[PDB]
C-alpha cells in the first residue's frame, strides 16, 4: 500500500536516518517533498562509517558540500530492478549519470551493489545502498 513520500520512508528506517539528517542540513528536502518521479539511493550506517576520516570530516562539515553529493544520490528517472533489464544510463538531480545495471539478478549503481531495491513510494522509488556514491 505504501506510507507516503520517500521522505516518510527514510525516517521510518534507522539506516536512512543519517541521510535524512544530511538532506535536512543541505536543504534537499524540498525535492523529495514533491510528488512525481524520483529514484533515491539511501546509504546505510555502514556506508557512513566506511567513509574516510578525511572526506567525511570535510563533507559533513559544510551544508553546500552535503547538498552537492546528495544531488548525485537522487536519480531523475524511476528505474526499479524489474525495469532496468541489463544496464541503463540514469540521470541524477546533480546532472551527472548513474550507471545502474542489473546482472545475474544483481542490481548495482556505479559498480556499488544495492542492498534492498524497489522500495515503493508515492513520488518515486528508493534503493537501499550499503555504500555511498562519490563522483
UniProtKB/Swiss-Prot annotation:
Induction: By TGF-beta.
Post-translational modification: Gamma-carboxylation is controversial. Gamma-carboxyglutamated; gamma-carboxyglutamate residues are formed by vitamin K dependent carboxylation; these residues may be required for binding to calcium. According to a more recent report, does not contain vitamin K-dependent gamma-carboxyglutamate residues.
Domain FAS1: residue ranges: 3-133
Tissue specificity of this protein: Highly expressed in the corneal epithelium. Expressed in heart, placenta, lung, liver, skeletal muscle, kidney and pancreas.
Localization in the cell: Secreted; Secreted, Extracellular space, Extracellular matrix
Assembly, per entry: Binds to type I, II, and IV collagens.
Protein's job: Plays a role in cell adhesion. May play a role in cell-collagen interactions.
Disorder cited: Corneal dystrophy, epithelial basement membrane: A bilateral anterior corneal dystrophy characterized by grayish epithelial fingerprint lines, geographic map-like lines, and dots (or microcysts) on slit-lamp examination. Pathologic studies show abnormal, redundant basement membrane and intraepithelial lacunae filled with cellular debris.
Protein name (database record): Transforming growth factor-beta-induced protein ig-h3
Amino acid at each position: 500500500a505504501g506510507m507516503g513520500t520517500v521522505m516518510d520512508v527514510l525516517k521510518g528506517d534507522n539506516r536512512f536516518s543519517m541521510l535524512v539528517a544530511a538532506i535536512q542540513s543541505a536543504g534537499l528536502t524540498e525535492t523529495l517533498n514533491r510528488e512525481g518521479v524520483y529514484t533515491v539511493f539511501a546509504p546505510t550506517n555502514e556506508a557512513f562509517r566506511a567513509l574516510p576520516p578525511r572526506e567525511r570530516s570535510r563533507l559533513l562539515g559544510d551544508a553546500k558540500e552535503l547538498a552537492n553529493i546528495l544531488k548525485y544520490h537522487i536519480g531523475d528517472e524511476i528505474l526499479v530492478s524489474g525495469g532496468i533489464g541489463a544496464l541503463v544510463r540514469l540521470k541524477s538531480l546533480q546532472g551527472d549519470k548513474l550507471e545502474v545495471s542489473l546482472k545475474n539478478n544483481v542490481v548495482s549503481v556505479n559498480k556499488e551493489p544495492v542492498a534492498e531495491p524497489d522500495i515503493m513510494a508515492t513520488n518515486g522509488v528508493v534503493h537501499v545502498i550499503t555504500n555511498v556514491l562519490q563522483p
